[PDB]
């Protein structure tokens with residue numbers, strides 16, 4: 421589909437057996453999801469933006485479906501105020517900016 | 520142009536007669552630029568990012584050119600880690616997400 425930017429580019433995603441709303445975010449290097457109890461091993465990480473850093477747990481090779489498009493990659497989990505789909509997964513679903 | 524997302528979507532902007540690099544950031548409602556001198560009046564505001572809230576100078580109705588596309592809108596200036604172009608201006612240059 422084509423998504424205009426009048427409103428936040430929120431779409432439904434499926435991860436770890438749960439449906440959620442997430443931002444298609446071209447300004448996010450990595451994918452950062454709101455606190456959730458994923459199984460498996462993880463590594464601690466810090467990611468910074470406006471206002472400073474948050475501590476997140478890094479899970480690798482996590483499957484996510486974004487608008488029916490499947491993707492698999494690194495997912496960071498932590499106290500983010502919104503679910504953010506970053507470039508590492510946006511590339512995998514064939515997402516581009518166009519103007 | 521069509522911009523893939525394997526690298527940061529960084530582009531050259533012109534604001535206040537000065538060239539800068541900025542990130543096309545579909546996850547940002549507003550445009551936030553690093554500390555700089557800008558002509559015109561401004562009002563202090565607060566914005567929150569992933570790591571908390573920061574104080575910024577809000578400039579209204581500012582001319583800014585993005586990849587040769589002209590926009591006129593609100594520009595926030597403050598201690599952001601990266602110059603970001605947010606949806607308020609991305610809509611003006613006709614930017615959309617596509618996959």
Ligand SMILES: CC(C)CN(C[C@@H](O)[C@H](Cc1ccccc1)NC(=O)O[C@H]1CO[C@H]2OCC[C@H]21)S(=O)(=O)c1ccc2ncsc2c1
Nearest residue numbers: 447448449450467468469470546547548549567568569601
């Ligand atoms: C700042 C940019 C460069 C990086 N961010 C992405 C950016 O799109 C954030 C997303 C967001 C965060 C919190 C609430 C809403 C939206 N928007 C943002 O701050 O917008 C400001 C300005 O407008 C206002 O509307 C929205 C909020 C206001 S990030 O989240 O900090 C990030 C993500 C992955 C990642 N991987 C390694 S670092 C890293 C850093």
